[PDB]
């Protein structure tokens, strides 16, 4: 569904001592964690890692849905020293070369981790910006410390003229938060066009391994997925079958679809003196006063959470928990 | 916005009551206030009563006033849907408002008015007894051209293109449209010009509102109205000019002497008044401002002709050569110099009336006039008009001999500036005086005596977006003392200061503009700096304003700055606060987000002019040895402070060195004094806080 291109800054400016021990190692590690979370909340999505080193853009992880390739590609960067200077234009041109074969019904995202305060580009970057906006490519830049006007014009131009995507990071925790923000999709207002895709297989799991089989690598396996079209037994991933080009999805597509469908209804905070109901939680059992800062003014007040779709009481930890995972409110299942 | 609305109320009450007001506007947010306040103030009375007389110091402010005036026209025409009599006349440079010198001359010098006088004389000569007319003429005085402006705004650029399309000349359109009483946007060198202020004063016909914009260099303009340096070469040009006058005497006495006798009779009968009342569209000469001079009944050399004027003129220039060939140090009192001249030869105190008339007579007898000789005759004529009149505060001075070859110079020192500004307080009223680089605003009631009201800036909010720190400790506190001398001392300490500039420029690579008190430090650090990594890592290239500034060089440096900042590169702008181009166009990240100041501004001392004006102001206001090292430097530093402020939506930081800055005020007096190394990390945090508070305060 999504096609994100992770462009990490790997130049001499990354050798400075801001993060611990340096910016490069923390960006690599947090990039590995970003690969984990991204492939955990986006199963049938694509990733591609490019680095900006030695004044050039170097593709280190081809566009694929297997996280292990990105993990190894990120492990190879921390064993070398980030030298040279960053090149935004070359990275955006190569990102274009990786996002052009992507179908129009799939989003094209480019996430740039920019630590330096200056880039080294051959040609005019504004023409590359015009090319990015023309072919519809959403660009998000996580810059370090001071702002760059080119990043403002790029993030604003690549998002329907709206500026709210050039995120400034000031610490490791902030960078973690931005990473987390790139996991979640962005249902923007769009420009109203047509959408649909067709042909998505569902596999049958083969447990046989006495003679083994493989139609994508011709190697030994312990069992493999079955294509309902070309009838090939390949390595197991819910992505595209490489023998006739169609998906092999299962309950994962339903999972991410329902995750994108979650309304996440925050329960209204109503004091016990206003609800006139005993302290109760419907997901567990709560006899704990929430408020008690003062004497009888706060202890006898407390806070009861309310789901209005069923008029039920809950405590805060369960509102947070059902906001993180699970469908909202067990009381909405009983009528 | 309420802050600017308070200034709107102040402009309203001062326009309705007071005759003059000293209004202090915040830098970057006070240009669009008076432009609408004046128009609405004109509409509340009745549509056509007083007119906007906006006065700026540069042409960029004139263009900004023109485009903002167009924003006023669109603003008033998009909210009501009714079309009114449009105003707005752009009075710019003569070379930039003419089309013929770009077709054949291909020059942008100051002699375009001479060629325009050749074309005008061609028109007059093809309308009298006979070069071509020009490009297009004889239709610039008609009603249609007089109505092309009130029906549609055509100012400067729109007037240049409109004249290039409609086949017209913009000079006569503007000149004929000064009497139309539109919104004229000219500079201070035109309101107080000993050659332009007379005609403008006769065409505007007074009864308007004058707007002194950025009125902080008014004393500088009043000083620049005189002081002409006689550097021995003007004596040779005056000698060759006298020889040319003798040749012209032989020519008019050779065959055609009837016109000289007829014009001579016009002088004996109707004098200078009739001579200037008969001629129309003829080139004029210089004059010590006739409205300020007030001298009538100009007799033509005690009723004499031209041979006597060139004889007494040869004696006068020879006396000048005699007074310029002396020992070395000598000061002149203009009265004692006139008395000594009378002791050498009697000529009385009337060579002024003898120049203003004889120059016009020669013009009326000349058809092929040489430019250098006539120019030298105009210089000697001005010197005569200013040794014959205007003596109170005037001080003739001779430059000492310092080798003695490059030396014979004679400069005249002007008089009190209050005299020069004076006529506007009888011609006009409710003259609004606005400036964003005035602090304190008490040196304008003191120096230049006039009764007015004082209104200071009352706008100060969002202090977290206007980082204003100052640097005192440079790691050793040894460059802040050596950077205050007229001549630099200990070059190694200056090299250490430059190294501190390399470290500071490396810490904050996001557009840097550095201002220097003089070009000596720049030329000393640019010769051999022992370092260049800032140009090799963060700045790619450096921008240096030449000690001899050039228009195309400065333009290519500014465009290079905008393109360098629009490519994510940045460049250090090593400029001088005392140099050319004070700038004023910001409101963008293309300008230097961080501005560096090398100490405090300094004025060149050990000069006879600073001692003459020093003792003169000492006798006037008794502000001796105190205001010439804090007021002028305060204005020069405020010229750099005004570039940092560019609206509350933008941010910036300006680093001022030296502790002496605490002795002077500043715009937005919220400053913290700490070291420079600490200011590196402080600015490192400000470059993120300024980026975080934006979306939080919105
Ligand atoms: S009429 Fe106009 S174009 Fe011709 S010389 Fe005069 S100013 Fe220039
Ligand atoms: Zn298949
Ligand atoms: Zn609970
Ligand atoms: Zn519910």
Structural class of chain A: alpha/beta
Give the overall form of chain A. globular
Alpha carbon gyration radius of chain B: 28 Å
In N-to-C order, the SSE pattern of chain A is: EHEEHHEHEHEHEEEEHEHHEEH
Helical residue percent band of chain A? 25-40%
Strands in their spatial order, largest beta sheet of chain A? 3-2-1-4-5-6
The number of helical elements of chain A comes to 10
Radius of gyration of chain A in whole Å, from Cα? 24 Å
Order of adjacent strands in the largest pleated sheet of chain B: 3-2-4-9-1-10
PDB class: transcription
Keywords: transcription initiation, transcription, macromolecular complex
Entry title: structure of yeast transcription PRE-initiation complex with tfiih
Chain A: Suppressor of stem-loop protein 1
Task: List the keywords.
part of a larger assembly, 2 chains, A: 335 residues, 10 helices, 13 strands, B: 698 residues, alpha/beta, six-stranded parallel sheet, 28 helices, 18 strands, 10% strand, globular, binds iron/sulfur cluster, 5'-3' DNA helicase activity (chain B), DNA-binding (chain B)
Describe this structure as you would to a colleague.
The structure is cut from a larger assembly and holds chains A (335 residues) and B (698 residues). With 335 residues, chain A is α/β, with parallel strands linked by helices. Chain A has helices spanning 23-41, 67-77, 88-99, 125-134, 149-157, 172-183, 251-261, 272-275, 296-299, 316-324, and strands at 2-9, 46-53, 56-64, 107-114, 138-144, 166-169, 200-201, 225-226, 233-234, 247-248, 268-270, 304-307, 312-314. In chain A, helix 1 runs parallel beside helix 6 (172-183). The longest helix of chain A is centred in the first third of the chain and has 19 residues, at 23-41. Chain B has 698 residues and is of the alpha/beta class. Chain B has 28 helices and 18 strands. In chain B, the strands form four sheets. Chain B has a six-stranded parallel β-sheet with strand order 3-2-4-9-1-10. Chain B has a six-stranded parallel β-sheet with strand order 11-17-16-13-15-14. In chain B, helix 25 links the parallel strand 14 and strand 15. Chain B is globular and about 85 Å long. The complex binds iron/sulfur cluster and zinc ion (ZN) (3 copies). Iron/sulfur cluster (SF4) is lined by residues 98-100, 115-116, 119, 134-135, 137, 169, 171 of chain B. Chain B: One of its GO terms (cellular component) is transcription factor TFIIH holo complex.
């Amino acid at each position: 569904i999504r096609s994100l291109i992770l462009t990490l800054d790997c130049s001499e400016a990354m050798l400075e001592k801001d993060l611990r021990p340096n910016r490069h190692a923390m960006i690599i590690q947090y990039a590995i964690d970003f690969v984990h979370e991204f492939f955990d909340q986006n199963p049938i999505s694509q990733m591609g890692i490019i680095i900006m080193r030695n004044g050039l853009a170097q593709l280190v992880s081809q566009v694929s849905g297997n996280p292990q390739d990105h993990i190894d590609a990120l492990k190879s960067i921390r064993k070398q020293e980030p030298k040279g200077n960053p090149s935004l234009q070359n990275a955006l041109e190569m990102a274009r070369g990786l996002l052009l074969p992507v179908p129009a019904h799939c989003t094209r995202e480019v996430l740039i981790v920019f630590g330096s305060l200056s880039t080294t580009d051959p040609g005019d970057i504004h023409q590359t910006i015009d090319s990015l906006v023309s072919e519809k490519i959403r660009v998000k830049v996580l810059g370090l410390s001071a702002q760059v006007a080119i990043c403002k014009e790029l993030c604003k131009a690549t998002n329907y003229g709206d500026e709210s995507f050039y995120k400034i990071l000031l610490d490791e925790t902030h960078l973690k938060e931005l990473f987390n923000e790139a996991v979640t999709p962005x249902x923007x207002x769009x420009x109203x066009x047509x959408x649909x895709x067709x042909x998505x297989x569902x596999p049958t799991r083969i447990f046989e391994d006495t003679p083994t089989f493989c139609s994508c690598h011709s190697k030994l396996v312990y069992g493999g997925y079955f294509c309902p079209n070309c009838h090939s037994k390949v390595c197991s991933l819910p992505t595209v079958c490489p023998c006739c080009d169609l998906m092999l999805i299962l309950x994962x597509x339903x999972x991410x679809x329902x995750x994108x469908x979650x309304x996440x209804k925050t329960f209204a905070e109503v004091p016990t003196t206003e609800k006139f109901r005993s302290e109760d939680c419907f997901s567990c059992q709560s006899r704990f006063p929430x408020x008690x800062x003062x004497x009888x003014x706060x202890x006898x007040x407390x806070s009861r959470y309310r789901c209005e779709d069923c008029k039920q009481e809950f405590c805060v930890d369960c509102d947070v928990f059902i906001h993180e995972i699970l469908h909202n409110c067990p009381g909405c299942e009983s009528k | 916005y309420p802050e600017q609305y308070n200034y709107m109320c102040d402009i309203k009450k001062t326009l309705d009551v007071g005759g003059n007001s000293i209004l202090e506007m915040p830098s970057g947010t006070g240009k669009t206030v008076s432009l609408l306040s004046l128009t609405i103030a004109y509409q509340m009375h009745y549509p056509e009563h007083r007119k906007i007389i906006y006065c700026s110091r540069t042409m960029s402010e004139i263009e900004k006033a023109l485009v903002e005036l167009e924003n006023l026209m669109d603003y008033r025409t998009k909210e009501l849907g009714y079309q009114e009599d449009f105003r707005g006349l752009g009075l710019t440079s003569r070379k930039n408002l003419c089309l013929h010198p770009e077709v054949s001359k291909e020059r942008k010098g100051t002699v375009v008015d001479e060629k325009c006088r050749r074309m005008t004389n061609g028109q007059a000569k093809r309308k009298l007894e006979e070069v071509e007319l020009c490009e297009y003429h004889e239709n610039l005085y008609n009603i249609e051209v007089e109505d092309y402006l009130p029906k549609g705004v055509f100012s400067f650029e729109k007037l240049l293109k409109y004249c290039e399309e409609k086949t017209l000349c913009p000079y006569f359109i503007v000149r004929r449209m000064i009497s139309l009483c539109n919104i004229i946007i000219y500079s201070y060198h035109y309101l107080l010009d000993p050659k332009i202020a007379e005609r403008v004063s006769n065409e505007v016909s007074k009864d308007s509102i004058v707007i002194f914009d950025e009125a902080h260099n008014i004393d500088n303009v009043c000083i620049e109205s005189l002081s002409l340096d006689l550097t021995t070469d003007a004596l040779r040009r005056a000698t060759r000019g006298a020889n040319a006058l003798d040749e012209r005497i032989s020519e008019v006495r050779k065959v055609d002497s009837q016109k000289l006798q007829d014009e001579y009779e016009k002088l004996v009968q109707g004098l200078x008044x009739x001579x200037x009342x008969x001629x129309x569209x003829x080139x004029x000469x210089x004059x010590x401002x006739x409205x300020x001079x007030x001298x009538x009944x100009x007799x033509x050399x005690x009723x004499x002709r031209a041979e006597h004027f060139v004889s007494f003129l040869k004696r006068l220039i020879e006396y000048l050569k005699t007074r310029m060939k002396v020992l070395h140090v000598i000061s002149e009192t203009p009265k004692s110099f006139l008395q000594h001249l009378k002791q050498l030869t009697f000529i009385e105190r009337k060579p002024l009336r003898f120049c203003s008339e004889r120059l016009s007579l020669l013009v009326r007898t000349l058809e092929v006039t040489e430019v250098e000789d006539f120019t030298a005759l105009k210089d000697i004529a001005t010197f005569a008009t200013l040794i014959s009149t205007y003596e109170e505060g005037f001080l003739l001075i001779i430059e000492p001999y310092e080798i003695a070859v490059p030396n014979p110079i004679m400069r005249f020192t002007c008089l009190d500036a209050s005299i020069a500004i004076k006529p506007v307080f009888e011609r006009f009223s409710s003259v609004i005086i606005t400036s964003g680089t005035i602090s304190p605003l008490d040196m304008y009631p003191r120096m230049l005596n006039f009764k007015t009201v004082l209104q200071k800036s009352y706008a100060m909010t969002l202090a977290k977006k206007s980082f204003l720190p100052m640097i005192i400790t440079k790691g050793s506190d040894q460059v802040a003392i050596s950077s205050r001398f007229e001549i630099r001392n200990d070059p190694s300490i200056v090299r250490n200061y430059g190294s501190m500039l390399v470290e500071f420029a490396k810490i904050t690579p996001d557009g840097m503009v550095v201002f220097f008190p003089s070009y000596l430090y720049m030329e000393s650090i640019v010769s051999m700096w022992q370092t260049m990594g800032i140009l090799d890592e963060v700045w790619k290239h450096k921008l240096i304003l030449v000690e001899t500034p050039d228009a195309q060089e400065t333009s290519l440096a500014l465009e290079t700055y905008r393109k360098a900042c629009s490519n994510g590169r940045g460049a250090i702008l090593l400029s001088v606060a005392r140099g050319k181009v004070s700038e004023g166009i910001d409101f963008d990240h293309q300008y230097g987000r961080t501005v560096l100041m090398i100490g405090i501004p300094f004025q060149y001392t050990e000069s006879r002019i600073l001692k003459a004006r020093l003792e003169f102001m000492r006798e006037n206001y008794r502000i001796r040895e105190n205001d010439f090292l804090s007021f002028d430097a305060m204005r020069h530093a405020a010229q750099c402070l005004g570039r940092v402020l560019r609206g509350k939506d933008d941010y910036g930081v300006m680093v001022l060195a030296d502790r002496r800055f605490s002795r002077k005020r500043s715009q937005l007096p919220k400053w913290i004094a700490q070291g420079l190394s600490d200011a590196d990390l402080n600015l490192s945090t400000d470059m993120a806080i300024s980026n975080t508070k934006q979306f939080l305060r919105t």
